[PDB]
Amino acid sequence: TDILIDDTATEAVRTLIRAFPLVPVSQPPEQGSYLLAEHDTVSLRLVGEKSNVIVDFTSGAAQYRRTKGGGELIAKAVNHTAHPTVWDATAGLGRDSFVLASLGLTVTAFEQHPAVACLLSDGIRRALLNPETQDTAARINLHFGNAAEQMPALVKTQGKPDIVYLDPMYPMAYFHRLVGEAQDEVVLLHTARQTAKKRVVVKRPRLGEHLAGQAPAYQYTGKSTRFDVYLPYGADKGLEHH
Amino acid sequence: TDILIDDTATEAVRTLIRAFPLVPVSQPPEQGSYLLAEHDTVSLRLVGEKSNVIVDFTELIAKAVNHTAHPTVWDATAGLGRDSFVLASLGLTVTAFEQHPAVACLLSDGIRRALLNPETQDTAARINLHFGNAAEQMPALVKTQGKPDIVYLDPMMAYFHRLVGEAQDEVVLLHTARQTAKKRVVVKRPRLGEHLAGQAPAYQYTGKSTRFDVYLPYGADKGLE
């Protein structure tokens, strides 16, 4: 991942990007995307295109309170009034991580892609500067790495989270199912079910297929969005309740 | 990737697998795939199914790589090694790159077994496997044994997907290949498939239901070929 560091880039930005395996370039590449560190923001650009992508949680809470269709059921899916800790295994741009943290939950947001993790990190950094989003941003802990591969070690380190939240961005044929995304889904769900203390929550399109082709214990259905909930391995549905 | 090592696994197999970041397991996983090392073979399995995937090696592309010039070829997307073997069959020395641990392990074992087989020994000896991401390993290999004559490629929120997804990986792959090859970068594509990384090639070879877009190294004058 290339990163163009403009002369106006603040010291905060310069220090932040230094923690990511990026490749500083003196000019934009001839093709494709690259990161741009200008002023006090890190953004992602596409050569030849004006529109960019930036993580900005300023209107996050507002956008959430106004969303309909089922996405607003995320709070009930993780049982937010129980004050659970949550590991967001597919953080990406952090939309859901910020929403969860805004409910008062302590979130560990996993993101394995260098560019995306950097974008998210800067978004959290800027969120801490705004008095209206400071408290929430402080409850978001970025974990730069692959969740399936690193959750087991983190469990031994700081204990199991109450909730593991998943929202994959996907919703020779036989061979591809064995080594491709299908297999990755199997491993992610399995690892999440060995990790969560209370539930593994998976966001899905209304008619979306079940993650790893596995049926959940119960679901929270909206019009166009739903949440599949799996109980941790060895949990007795008789004791558990929702 | 999990690997179940049966007690019958030969030392040749036990040695081969040590080159990959595989997770040894005492029993198959609850669900999904895993590698099985039994007797003198490494195979891929799916829990619940009786079948198994194994690499067993027992003219359009020839022109695309201009085999007549007997060029060295680097297969940046080796996979199960089908095209690596074909290229090697033409008498060319091939260096195959594969980044997936399971796929790489399977290919490595197929090459190893092919060497033990008379009718494939000659061809298999011309295939060298390199584990890792091509975009990353090729530059490092260049500084070692030098540039190859040809780099062979055969891969396979919207805006966001294009910037960090497969679209970007394509750009990186082609760019690196064009900086590695000394003569040509050959890309396999379906009959009327779209251009890789959305870039136009210098020329191409259209076959029955397949096509090969050919790019030239950076700073190359097409008029000289």
Swiss-Prot record, chain B:
Its EC number is 2.1.1.242. One of its GO terms (molecular function) is rRNA (guanine-N2-)-methyltransferase activity. It is an enzyme of class 2 (transferase). It is found in: Cytoplasm. Keywords: Cytoplasm, Methyltransferase, rRNA processing, S-adenosyl-L-methionine, Transferase. One of its GO terms (cellular component) is cytoplasm. Its main location: cytoplasm. It catalyses: guanosine(1516) in 16S rRNA + S-adenosyl-L-methionine = N(2)-methylguanosine(1516) in 16S rRNA + S-adenosyl-L-homocysteine + H(+). InterPro entries: 16SrRNA_methylTrfase_J, SAM-dependent_MTases_sf. It holds the Pfam family SAM_MT. The keyword Protease does not apply. Specifically methylates the guanosine in position 1516 of 16S rRNA. Belongs to the methyltransferase superfamily. RsmJ family. This is Ribosomal RNA small subunit methyltransferase J.
